[PDB]
Amino acid sequence: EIETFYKMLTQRAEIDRAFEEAAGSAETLSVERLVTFLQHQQREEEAGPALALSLIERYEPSETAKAQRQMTKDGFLMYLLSADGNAFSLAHRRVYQDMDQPLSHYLVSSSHNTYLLEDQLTGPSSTEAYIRALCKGCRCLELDCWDGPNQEPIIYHGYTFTSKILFCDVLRAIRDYAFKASPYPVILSLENHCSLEQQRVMARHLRAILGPILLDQPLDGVTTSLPSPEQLKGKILLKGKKLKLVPELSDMIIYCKSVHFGGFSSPGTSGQAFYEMASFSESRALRLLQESGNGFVRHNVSCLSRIYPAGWRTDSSNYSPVEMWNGGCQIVALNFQTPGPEMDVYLGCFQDNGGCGYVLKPAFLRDPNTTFNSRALTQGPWWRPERLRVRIISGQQLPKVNKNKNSIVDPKVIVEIHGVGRDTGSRQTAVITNNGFNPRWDMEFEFEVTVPDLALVRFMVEDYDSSSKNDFIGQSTIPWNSLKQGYRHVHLLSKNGDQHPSATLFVKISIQD
């Protein structure tokens, strides 16, 4: 009974089944059989003895089997629960993209009113807020500078009751964390409401504190286009108004001069210079995407655009970034302090490319002559329909969330597709009652995705409640091109983006054209 219980609790038929198929009669997976699995099931492109062997050396617990080059059911499971078995491509969890194109070519991880920890009206501000964002890979930060006592500028939310902090204090924190998560450039958006004098103080602090990290001169030969993340590695650059404004500050604005949206027209006139950056509220952005779409896109190829949350979002709620990315908008600022599907999707996007904060835009969005408009889909390279089938098999050790000890989760799983409007979809599994340890769904969904290069697949697990709103249990959002095939485990994250060490979903993914 003990082994029974101990082992039965521990038992996963789906795994058993999976191994069996792979291994057939044998109680072991030979290299060849493993290689076959890797290819047929896991659809690995580098599938071959070499991979198989590394998987064995890496994950096989049995010394006999390891040495003898074979994989036991145990090693199978371990591989499946490891970074290699993760539905989120391990290969993409390291900088692997081309980091040599103009900044305008990458989506950049950006935060809105970074200094804030809660609401926009009366919640607190803190350097901690900048540290958190930076530690989550945020590249573009916001500083709302106002005159403070003792000729020391402060940062807070202009015209509200949000607590205040010191501009200098903010700079040190940025200085200390700017590159903890990535080596690529950090952009500081200065919304300067300070007096001339205090503006000078700002400049002094900038130079004194940031020192050599601060970019205060154009790079050599950085003429027709924006420098690349590579060219700006290890640097912090300022975005703000460039000559009310003291020269000390205005002179530090090199590649990001705040500008009012003129309109889009590129033959050298109208559509701003590569070193000019416009901002658009969520509303105006949608409208321009509604009406212009392709203009914006084309605009965004050589130009950085910044989008920020609608003013009514005083609760610091966030909008969907995806809609902005579909127009090539790169600096899509969100309230990083706020848990929700939006940051889930955001951080899922940026978990790609090594989490360095710059993710290369799809080629059609880097083509100045594109006729793409996610909203009016016509044929073109972006059109490449795929058939995704996702099987939600079972869940393991779902984080018991709210109640301290009184009930068991009644989990269900929602799988959503995020991307161009026609691709967006959502489906959900049934609810398993009182089981978070090993709920088993064995449900399969199928989606047709026409513009995968802009899609993300999200897995959300909820605790069903008949009486109330279902509690969020965990989630995971995987960019389409990082979605691995075959049997994989989805590693669930908390509301706050934290890793749940033992919480997973076991799935089987398949993508066919």
The residue range among 56-64, 309-317, 345-353, 434-442 that interacts with La ion, by the rule CB under 5 A, is 434-442
173-178 contacts, C-beta under 8 A, 24 or more apart: 173/127, 173/128, 173/130, 173/131, 174/130, 174/134, 174/141, 174/210, 174/236, 175/209, 175/210, 175/211, 175/213, 176/131, 177/130, 177/131, 177/134, 177/135, 178/134, 178/213, 178/236
C-alpha triplet 476, 478, 480: angle, nearest 5°: 155
Of 32, 291, 442, 465, which lies in the binding site for La ion, with binding defined by CB under 5 A? 465
Residue 160 binds La ion, judged by CB under 5 A:
no
Q: How far is the CB of 306 from La ion (least distance, A)?
A: 11
Residue 310 binds La ion, judged by CB under 5 A:
no
Element (DSSP H or E) covering residue 476? strand 471-479
Q: How far is the CB of 3 from La ion (least distance, A)?
A: 29
478 marked as binding residue: no
205 given a catalytic annotation: no
Applying CB under 5 A, what is the total number of residues that bind La ion? Answer: 10
Q: How far is the CB of 403 from La ion (least distance, A)?
A: 7
Angle between helices 73-81 and 13-23 in degrees, nearest 10: 110
306 marked as binding residue: yes
Those residues whose C-beta lies under 8 Å from the C-beta of residue 386, and which sit 6 or more positions away, are: 448, 449, 452, 511, 512, 513
Taking a C-beta distance cutoff of 8 angstroms, is the pair 249, 143 a contact?
A: no
The residue range among 23-31, 106-114, 282-290, 373-381 that interacts with La ion, by the rule CB under 5 A, is 106-114
DSSP 221-276: T--SSPPPTTTTTT-EEEEE------HHHHTT--SEEEE-------SSSSS--TTE
Residue 400 binds La ion, judged by CB under 5 A:
no
Which candidate in 105, 157, 299, 489 is catalytic? Answer: 157
Q: Which is nearer to La ion, 265 or 407 (CB)?
A: 407
Q: Which is nearer to La ion, 25 or 467 (CB)?
A: 467
464 marked as binding residue: yes
Tell me, what DSSP letter sits at residue 337? T
Q: Which is nearer to La ion, 84 or 410 (CB)?
A: 410
Strand partners, 486: 509
Q: How far is the CB of 471 from La ion (least distance, A)?
A: 4
Of 14, 20, 251, 471, which lies in the binding site for La ion, with binding defined by CB under 5 A? 471
Taking a C-beta distance cutoff of 8 angstroms, is the pair 487, 362 a contact?
A: no
Residue 144 binds La ion, judged by CB under 5 A:
yes
193 given a catalytic annotation: no
The residue range among 16-24, 254-262, 438-446, 458-466 that interacts with La ion, by the rule CB under 5 A, is 458-466
C-alpha triplet 302, 187, 214: angle, nearest 5°: 115
Of 282, 342, 352, 410, which lies in the binding site for La ion, with binding defined by CB under 5 A? 410
Q: How far is the CB of 254 from La ion (least distance, A)?
A: 21
Please give the torsion angle defined by the CA atoms of residues 307, 175, 93 and 451, in that order, rounded to the nearest 10 degrees: 10
Q: Which is nearer to La ion, 434 or 496 (CB)?
A: 434
The residue range among 18-26, 355-363, 431-439, 496-504 that interacts with La ion, by the rule CB under 5 A, is 431-439
Q: How far is the CB of 510 from La ion (least distance, A)?
A: 31
Alpha-carbon distance 480 to 420, whole Å? 12
Residue 463 binds La ion, judged by CB under 5 A:
yes
Three-state SS sequence of 136-205: CCCCEEEEEEECCHHHCCEECCCCCCCCCEEHHHHHHHHHHHCCCCCCCCEEEEEEECCCHHHHHHHHHH
Q: How many CA atoms lie within 13 A of 344 on its CB side?
A: 23
* Residue 438, φ and ψ in degrees, nearest 5: -160, 55
Residue 290 binds La ion, judged by CB under 5 A:
no
The residue range among 112-120, 159-167, 344-352, 415-423 that interacts with La ion, by the rule CB under 5 A, is 112-120
239 marked as binding residue: yes
Strand partners, 448: 387
Of 147, 191, 230, 367, which lies in the binding site for La ion, with binding defined by CB under 5 A? 191
Q: How far is the CB of 342 from La ion (least distance, A)?
A: 18
Residue 407 binds La ion, judged by CB under 5 A:
yes
Which candidate in 40, 92, 105, 112 is catalytic? Answer: 112
27 marked as binding residue: no
Element (DSSP H or E) covering residue 81? helix 73-81
Residue 21 binds La ion, judged by CB under 5 A:
no
147 marked as binding residue: no
241 marked as binding residue: yes
Alpha-carbon distance 253 to 264, whole Å? 23
467 marked as binding residue: no
Please give the torsion angle defined by the CA atoms of residues 198, 202, 203 and 205, in that order, rounded to the nearest 10 degrees: 130
32 marked as binding residue: no
Residue nearest to La ion (CB): 410
Please give the torsion angle defined by the CA atoms of residues 373, 376, 377 and 380, in that order, rounded to the nearest 10 degrees: -50
The residue range among 183-191, 200-208, 291-299, 366-374 that interacts with La ion, by the rule CB under 5 A, is 183-191
1 marked as binding residue: yes
Q: Which is nearer to La ion, 408 or 511 (CB)?
A: 408
142 marked as binding residue: yes
Alpha-carbon distance 405 to 193, whole Å? 51
Tell me, what DSSP letter sits at residue 209? I
Q: Which is nearer to La ion, 191 or 444 (CB)?
A: 191
Instruction: List residues forming the annotated binding site.
Output: 1, 113, 142, 144, 191, 239, 241, 279, 306, 408, 410, 434, 463-465
Q: Which residues would be at the binding site for La ion (CB under 5 A)?
A: 113, 144, 191, 407-408, 410, 434, 463, 465, 471
Instruction: List residues forming the annotated binding site for substrate.
Output: 239, 241, 279, 306
Residues recognised as catalytic? 112, 157
